Design an enzyme around this catalytic site. Structure first.
Site, mmCIF file in Angstrom:
data_model
loop_
_atom_site.group_PDB
_atom_site.id
_atom_site.type_symbol
_atom_site.label_atom_id
_atom_site.label_comp_id
_atom_site.label_asym_id
_atom_site.label_seq_id
_atom_site.Cartn_x
_atom_site.Cartn_y
_atom_site.Cartn_z
ATOM 1 N N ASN A 469 10.184 28.421 70.940
ATOM 2 C CA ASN A 469 9.717 28.327 72.316
ATOM 3 C C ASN A 469 9.727 26.874 72.775
ATOM 4 O O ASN A 469 9.918 25.958 71.969
ATOM 5 C CB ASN A 469 8.327 28.950 72.417
ATOM 6 N N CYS A 471 7.687 24.496 73.380
ATOM 7 C CA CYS A 471 6.892 23.521 72.644
ATOM 8 C C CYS A 471 6.948 23.732 71.135
ATOM 9 O O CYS A 471 6.120 23.172 70.408
ATOM 10 C CB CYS A 471 5.446 23.532 73.136
ATOM 11 N N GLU A 473 6.252 25.821 68.773
ATOM 12 C CA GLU A 473 5.223 26.343 67.884
ATOM 13 C C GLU A 473 5.471 27.781 67.451
ATOM 14 O O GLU A 473 5.053 28.163 66.354
ATOM 15 C CB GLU A 473 3.845 26.252 68.546
#
Ligand SMILES: Nc1ncnc2c1ncn2[C@H]1C[C@H](O)[C@@H](COP(=O)(O)OP(=O)(O)OP(=O)(O)O)O1
Ligand SMILES: Nc1ncnc2c1ncn2[C@H]1C[C@H](O)[C@@H](COP(=O)(O)OP(=O)(O)OP(=O)(O)O)O1
Ligand SMILES: [Mg+2]
Ligand SMILES: [Mg+2]
Lengths: 899, 899
Positions: A469, A471, A473
């Protein structure tokens, strides 16, 4: 199943928590709701984000009525507007917006419990009553929070009757198991913040390149992020069946990049979140690594060139204007010697002859000057929207073999996608070099360690983990959704004790609710709906571990602080897996589990082997994780609990399996961390010891970081000296107690009815030289330089440190030197404060946490401006040392927009 | 139904037409098929385009077998590979490519007749035999040709067995009338060159913005063009239901523009054809009009700025390198005074401080210089691919009311799309001004006259005509296809007679085949398939009217030449409508006709009122068309035929209606005009009287324009003087007959064994100064300047005009001054030739033809570099005077890529 540890049964709604109402407004140098009811301990900015971005602003019915459903409990019934009662009131106030935090607390947990009940999750009605009560309590005192899509969507149709049509969305009926097309835009919440999406090497069919932009646009419209590994796209020049050859990966990336820039995420100011990942063996990877580097060069050229045109075109127009005679000769470079000079200057400044010719043909038509917009280097400049690559986080997937090749100085083959043949051979070291320089110049590319990711992949039978995704994570199979929620790790710390069993109770019940949100959700794709139904990934996380560490009196770079982190990471994930295992017992494991059991309990085992602190004995992992440090953990309980809950988590796993293929994930918590009043977001440490809190009035007030007195309380310091140290850092706001420039010293000169003017013109506290306005006073003012005469500039700065504060605890009185690292932050505090945390300090705790996390840890390490390219690559290499799955770098003041 | 006028029954295949074989190759300073069989009269470039782009290059079975179908005639049976016979030969030569023109002639007409028969179009089997024979004959002698998609697609599955899967394509079963999804990529030909496509003000649903790029990509992949009126897209800042507001029209246009740039049309070098049209009352139209203007400014800045960075970065690196001491002080602007000077120069040249800082941090790491690519202004520069707007023809739709507002100096309201309210009020004259300047700076925007288009719209009940195809000739409802074919108007001119009834026979039978291509086609959209089935638009056109006019001895700016054009325009369209009316009698009108009969025969009537030359009596037209001039037509037959065929065309129309809602359209014929050896393309005049023909060897040979001797034959000139005039323009290639510099004059100096060296080193004919190499000769050579001494420079240029030719007929001997305008071309011929055709000459014949054309006329008028913005707008206004539907301008040497 569900028991009660935070709430009563009698005052169970909000067992003794106060409420207040604040105003929240934003206006430019535009929005305002005068009554915003929140829990009393909530900061101003927490109330801000709640009203500005979580409150359903319109369409809330003023009077509601329940809708009784046979078989579901009393307090959980859906509600619809009661037009019999709204017909009473004027139509101005029949439908309004939300006004109080408990409205949202109620609709969130009400929808969670309503769906959770009809899914048969709670075995009693008292458990549902407890779960309902417990959930809203944890929200009310900022203990945990779901990702923002849950905040502004779930419970809208359950608590109020809000509905609407919806196209292209799908869910799996929890009763039938059949895939269905959603017809309500609200009955099934859309609670997922981001998605990993696949793309096939195909232009116009479903799952292809052009269709992906439709799929990404669908996500951007409602506010979700998307990420995709694009490496299956054949490289530039690769043959295509039909006849010609492909334009290549970069061409299509520029399409989706330009598409992302035009869609406001949620209709708001917010940018669209986009992750673009390419594999290192891709033929066009060199273009990919340097994508943002070149586009940045184009921006710099765009503005140097645009301002050049503006200047020299003005010179040419001046030379034409200042000509004695007709316009026909004024515009002839031969007859007009001055115009010939201005063109001479224009040509030598590389102004193209073609445009010099057109300003000449402008002027003979009778034109004084032409509009030639120039661009700036600031963030808002059109130059940035002109170039490409600005609307995505770009990261490369590196395998262990490539990192073996740089250390061996081996060759590295870029292989074609169409036939698997070698398109190019390049030294791995110069490719690694390009990555390092590109990330040293601009932020990108980030880096993800393919083999480390897939060594902890629970379901490899359904493909590899290829992307993530925006960011970085959430890491699972393509076409699955991130289902996230995070807990305030500080809310569990009373006196000097960490409420451990309240913490395990927290994760257990949030593992339950995140499971319900998989059950209740609709999805933007048929395959995403089917897959998330079949694997049911969860992403439970935490924030405020930097604040907690400081509160319990431990430094961020301490070894005890990292052991603590790895502990609570192990406990949360262990209990979450054990909780999901209990869910699989009473409800069945996810459908993709039976074929994947051999692998899923392998990674479950490896997690357990690490909670016991084992050095070796890891099955099929490429880089052994950093084991749970038993010795430096500042509490033997948590290590014993991390061992026990992981021991059981495996046992129930062998018994029934798991309801969910992933459980935990550490997000940035960039905005839910604000509504939870988290001192530190995600896994980050704190950044300062003197902060500026917005308060009810709308102004910003200088305050001590609240964790500093608390830290000075949990160690051996008395309340007399804590305010001494606090006064040192924040200041005294007055010269009444100032030793060097006293009142008595001031009235030594003609001061008298001029002190109270000074004394709280002094509490704005902008490192004062506030001796400014008085004319009459025993005096001509040149400019800056009437720094007042009598005192040394050291006396002045000593007085400055007194009133305005040092903003650091370095040099503070009564503070033992052994207790100084406990107050280290990510940036130096104050102006000649010099201590800060290492790049390695950040990395080593990500490691300590990564070993007990299903996915990865959101992170972009801020590095000093003085950093070198070798240090950049060293950070990447050091991350791979300790089983890090992904990392990202940004050097202070790298980018062009930075003043 | 079908009768025979060009072919025999016995030698009917190719009644006495010869054949030859040529080599055709292309190589860079890559492709070659050594045997290309074509008709003998075919030029080299005609054979080139046939092999290079029409021949099916691979997958043609070496041995075929017919497949007998019950009920279809003998000679029309589909064919499939005969593996029983291919199993004999080696697998290298089982499947090959096409090699001869009759292969393509056969597969085209065979597929036409095969589908036409099973559609019951021919009432006999002898008619099918005739149609089959007649069609391939007209193709063989370059009389007419379908648009290129027909050339490389239709007949592939009928003549050979070539097949393959296909997704997303649809057709209407001619038997059932039901919409069906195509499963063969070849059984139904894809014969349509372009499409008009609709777009809804919606992001992610079908027919919306993002889905349009998928629909456009589908077209680009196979080589078709697309056009769309984007004005329904709400303007920037317009409210959107959900909450926020739209990014605006320009943002999404930049998506599709960037998408178009990345898809090679057909996989080839060819660019994607794209038409982008916006209405004048759109809120963002000012951004639209100046779109290419600003992006062009960015290109100029991109290259001025990039080269600036390269120069001054090199200066900074030189100052660091040339420093006595360490790198730490070499890179300090204080300690290094020379580096401070180089930064001083960099800053004053607007090099951003941010990038100056990074080259400094480069150098201290130990770097000699950084890669900073700079860009050029030439066509291939990356600067052009960086900026937007480069991949589409942009045109604005103007209504009569707007043109009323500029002449009244009235206000003009830009109205919002969401609520119909006024977003902005601006003087129409400054908006008209912006259009004029933008089209004076760059080509765009083109202009289309909404009210003129819809006054001739045959089916307004199914919506307005909102857009067009990339070259603006096809104008019908959204989501319909252009079905085009053009005739060589010169192939009908023997001796001094125009084969008129062979011309009417031509249009009749090509109206039939274009109808069959509607019947046999599959389509890229469900709605496009349904609509083209329901309206069956045809686009029959012509080319080589400039060449024909010259051949018959008439000038392009003559009034007789325009009357001739309007004649043959009227006859072709009249017969085409009458033909389609006969088709509607034996087969039924298109399904959309019954509700539209009132309007369709109104425009049919208006066409007839113009063939009779009426001044007034036009029903519901905004600008009365230019009537068929009876008096200056150089043949009373054609005017009487234009009257008669239009008279009947209406009569059968009242009788049965029409099988087709559109029939005629004048395309550019940019490439099919090459394979037909058309001297002039589309409606264009010729461009020169001395041309350079590529011939079999692969070299280019200077030749007289073949229409010049023919013109000098159809007027009163004898064969002695025609070669006199020809020798004047093309030259003599020798000094044997040269009066001023004779052989005798040459040997006046030491020349003797140096003449035959000169005499056909002289036939390259590059305006000679070929007196170069000889050393030994009675001579040091400075540079250019040993122009040979003895003769005047007028004697030299007189000798030059003798050997090399004047390349014009101005000043030619024996040419009467009244016969000079007959040789006027679109550009001055030769170097001090000065005659050329007016901008008004182009416009006035488009008018003369537009009155008898269902759609519009492809055109971009080339205007002198000296043109003004007022002249630009004057041309637009003058076009609207005479019922022109669309126009486009390009001023000579406007754009930046022009040297
Ligand atoms: N016209 C084109 N211009 C540029 N790239 C193209 C074009 N058509 C396809 N491509 C690229 C995009 C992807 O890299 C890939 C997709 O090709 P596409 O034909 O859609 O896939 P496919 O799976 O049918 O295979 P193939 O390309 O072999 O026919 O080729
Ligand atoms: N997030 C966005 N950012 C920018 N423009 C957007 C966004 N969403 C929609 N638009 C623009 C694109 C078109 O101009 C128009 C399409 O909006 P969309 O919601 O797709 O249509 P709609 O017909 O459902 O109406 P509405 O916008 O009122 O809900 O709004
Ligand atoms: Mg392909
Ligand atoms: Mg909308």
């Amino acid at each position: 199943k569900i028991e009660r540890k935070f709430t009563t049964a009698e005052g169970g709604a909000y067992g003794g928590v106060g409420f207040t109402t604040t105003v929240s407004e934003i206006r430019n140098p535009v929005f305002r709701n005068e009554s915003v009811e929140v829990p009393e301990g909530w900061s101003q900015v927490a109330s801000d984000v709640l009203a500005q971005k979580y409150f359903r602003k319109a369409g809330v019915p003023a009077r509601l009525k329940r809708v009784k459903e046979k078989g579901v409990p009393d307090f959980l019934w859906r509600s619809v507007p009661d037009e019999a009662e709204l017909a009473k009131l004027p139509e101005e106030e029949r439908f309004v917006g939300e006004t109080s935090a408990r409205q949202v607390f109620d609709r969130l947990a009400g929808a969670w419990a309503y769906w959770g009940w009809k899914g048969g999750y709670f075995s009693t009605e008292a458990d549902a009553r407890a779960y309902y009560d417990e959930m809203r309590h944890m929200l009310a005192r900022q203990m945990a929070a779901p990702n923002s899509p849950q905040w502004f969507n779930t419970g809208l149709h359950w608590a109020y009757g809000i509905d609407g049509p919806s196209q292209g969305h799908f869910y799996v009926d929890h009763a039938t198991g059949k895939l269905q097309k959603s017809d309500s835009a609200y009955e099934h919440p859309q609670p997922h913040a981001c998605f990993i999406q696949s793309v096939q090497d195909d232009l116009v069919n479903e799952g292809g390149i052009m269709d992906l932009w439709v799929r990404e646009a669908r996500l951007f419209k409602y506010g979700s992020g998307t990420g995709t590994n694009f490496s299956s796209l054949r490289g530039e020049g690769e043959k295509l069946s039909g006849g010609g050859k492909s334009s290549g990966l970069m061409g299509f990336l520029k399409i989706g990049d330009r598409a992302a820039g035009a869609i406001k995420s949620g209709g708001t100011t917010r940018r669209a979140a986009k992750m673009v990942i390419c594999d290192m063996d891709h033929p066009d990877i060199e273009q990919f690594i340097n994508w943002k580097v070149i586009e940045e060069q184009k921006v710099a050229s765009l503005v140097a060139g645009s301002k050049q045109h503006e200047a020299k075109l003005n010179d040419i127009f001046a030379a034409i204007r200042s000509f004695d005679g007709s316009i026909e000769g004024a515009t002839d470079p031969a007859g007009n010697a001055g115009l010939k000079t201005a063109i001479r200057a224009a040509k030598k400044a590389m102004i193209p002859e073609t445009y010099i010719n057109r300003v000449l043909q402008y002027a003979r038509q009778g034109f004084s000057s032409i509009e030639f917009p120039t661009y700036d280097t600031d963030w808002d400049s059109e130059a940035y929207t002109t170039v490409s690559g600005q609307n995505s986080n770009n990261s490369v997937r590196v395998t262990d073999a490539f990192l073996q090749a740089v250390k061996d100085d081996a060759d590295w083959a870029l292989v074609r996608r169409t036939d698997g043949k070698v398109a190019k051979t390049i030294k791995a070291r110069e490719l690694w070099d390009q990555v390092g320089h590109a990330a040293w110049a601009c932020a990108d590319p980030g880096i993800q360690f393919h083999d480390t990711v897939n060594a902890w992949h629970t379901c490899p039978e359904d493909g590899q983990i290829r992307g993530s995704n925006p960011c970085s994570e959430y890491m699972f199979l393509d076409d699955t959704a991130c289902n996230l929620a995070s807990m305030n790790l500080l809310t569990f710390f009373e006196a000097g004790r960490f409420d451990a069993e309240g913490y395990v109770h927290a994760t257990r019940l949030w593992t339950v609710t995140l499971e319900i949100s998989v059950m209740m959700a609709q999805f933007p794709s048929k395959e995403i709906a089917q897959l998330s139904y079949d694997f049911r990934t969860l992403g439970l996380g935490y924030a405020n571990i930097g604040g907690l560490l400081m509160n319990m009196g431990l430094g961020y770079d301490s070894s005890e602080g990292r052991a603590l982190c790895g502990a609570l990471s192990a406990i949360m994930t262990g209990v979450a897996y054990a909780t999901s295992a209990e869910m699989a017992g009473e409800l069945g494991a996810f459908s993709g589990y039976e074929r994947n059991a051999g692998h899923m309990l392998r990674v479950i085992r490896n997690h357990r082997t690490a909670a016991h602190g084992h050095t070796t004995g890891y099955e099929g992992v490429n880089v052994s994780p950093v084991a749970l440090d038993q010795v430096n953990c500042p509490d033997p309980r948590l290590v014993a609990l991390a061992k026990s809950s992981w021991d059981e988590a495996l046992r129930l796993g062998e018994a029934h399996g798991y309801r969910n293929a992933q459980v935990t994930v550490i997000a940035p918590t960039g905005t839910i961390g604000l509504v939870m009043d988290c001192d530190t977001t995600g896994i980050e440490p704190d950044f300062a010891l003197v902060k500026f809190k917005k308060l009810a009035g709308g102004g910003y007030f200088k305050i001590i970081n609240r964790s500093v007195p608390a830290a000075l309380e949990t160690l051996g310091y008395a309340s007399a000296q804590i305010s001494q140290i606090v006064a040192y850092a924040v200041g005294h706001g007055t010269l009444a107690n100032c030793p060097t420039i006293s009142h008595s010293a001031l009235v030594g000169h003609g001061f008298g009815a001029r002190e109270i003017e000074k004394i709280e013109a002094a509490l704005p506290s902008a490192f004062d030289i506030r001796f400014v306005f008085n004319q009459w006073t025993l005096g001509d003012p040149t400019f800056d330089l009437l720094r007042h005469l009598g005192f040394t500039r050291a006396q002045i700065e000593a007085a400055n440190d007194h009133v305005c504060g040092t903003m650091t605890l370095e040099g503070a009185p009564h503070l033992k030197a052994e207790h100084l690292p406990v107050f280290d932050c990510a940036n130096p505090c104050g102006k000649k404060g010099k201590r800060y945390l290492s790049v390695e300090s950040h990395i080593h705790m990500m490691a300590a946490a990564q070993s007990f996390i299903s996915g990865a840890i959101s992170k972009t390490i801020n590095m000093p401006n003085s950093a070198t390219i070798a240090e950049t690559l060293a950070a990447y290499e050091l991350s791979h040392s300790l089983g890090i799955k992904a990392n990202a770098l940004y050097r202070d003041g790298s980018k062009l927009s930075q003043p």
